[PDB]
């Protein structure tokens, strides 16, 4: 499992923080609450 600030990248097969996707313009769905 991951946190509410993390998402699970199936390639790395690990939890990736949302802070890396906040600088994006189309982060995952669960990072809306974080970013």
């Amino acid at each position: 499992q991951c946190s509410a600030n993390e998402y699970f990248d199936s390639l790395l097969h690990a939890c990736i923080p949302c802070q890396l996707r906040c600088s994006s313009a189309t982060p995952p769905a669960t990072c809306a609450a974080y970013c």
Partner: antibody, heavy 120, light 108 residues
Framework: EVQLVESGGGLVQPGGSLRLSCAAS????????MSWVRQAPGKGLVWVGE????????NYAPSLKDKFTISRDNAKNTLYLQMNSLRAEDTAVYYC?????????????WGQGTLVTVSS | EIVMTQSPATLSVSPGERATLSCKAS??????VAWYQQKPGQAPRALIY???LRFSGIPARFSGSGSGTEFTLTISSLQSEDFAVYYC?????????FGAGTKLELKR
């Protein structure tokens, strides 16, 4: 030094079998996912399969389903690839990679790659 | 399987200039596209993993972007060491399907 030395792999005729070893020394082999990928002579990459750390969830590829069995002996820190009923259309170089996300940075380590040529 | 289509198959460019590749997908794979560089003889070398997130030791000139089905990889300024093949990959649906390939050449 992270190292992925891949032994085994030579020449075989259509329908033969072959086991490949991917010895890992230099990183926590027993804690990350492992994957195999082939690339035919002068052609693009072609995924094969991955395997969970504790061998609790293996993922193969449809086209090669039933053809390649994947295993791993964490004790010897090494990844195996059992090949069955091959064909000249299966000829390619076989790498063994490993992608994870520890230390806050995305890593990736590829082996030398060993060639497997199928032909009569 | 899903089809990743890379265009152009070959891009001629000189050091210093930029390069923008493309990787079209058969179906919406969302922000789940990686990028790999491979040189003649050496194994592949990862560059981007979550469409825009780079790997470790990857310079900043390498920039990935795109979501859904249209993806690209920008190389703001080409060094000598950056002229090689560039593949793309999707991991939104097994089997993980690679791209066709975009090989750069040093124009002289």
């Amino acid at each position: 030094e992270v190292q992925l030395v891949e032994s085994g792999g030579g020449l075989v005729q259509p329908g033969g079998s072959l086991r490949l070893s991917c010895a890992a020394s230099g990183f926590t082999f027993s804690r990350y996912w492992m994957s195999w990928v082939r690339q035919a002579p002068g052609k693009g990459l072609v995924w094969v399969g991955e395997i969970n750390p504790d061998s609790s969830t293996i993922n193969y590829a449809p086209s090669l389903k039933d053809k390649f069995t994947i295993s791993r002996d964490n004790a010897k820190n090494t990844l195996y690839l059992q090949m069955n009923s091959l064909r000249a259309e299966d000829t390619a170089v076989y790498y063994c990679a490993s992608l994870y996300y520890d230390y806050g940075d995305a890593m990736d380590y590829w082996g030398q790659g060993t060639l497997v040529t199928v032909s009569s | 399987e899903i089809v990743m289509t890379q265009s152009p198959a070959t891009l001629s460019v000189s050091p210093g200039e930029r390069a923008t590749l493309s990787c079209k997908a058969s179906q919406s794979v969302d922000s789940n596209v990686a990028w790999y560089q491979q040189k003649p003889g050496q194994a592949p070398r990862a560059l981007i993993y979550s469409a825009s997130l780079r790997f470790s030791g990857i310079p900043a000139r390498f920039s990935g972007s795109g979501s859904g089905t249209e993806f690209t990889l920008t190389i703001s300024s080409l060094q000598s060491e950056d002229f090689a093949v560039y593949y793309c990959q999707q991991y939104n649906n097994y089997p993980l399907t690679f791209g066709a390939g975009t090989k750069l050449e040093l124009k002289r």
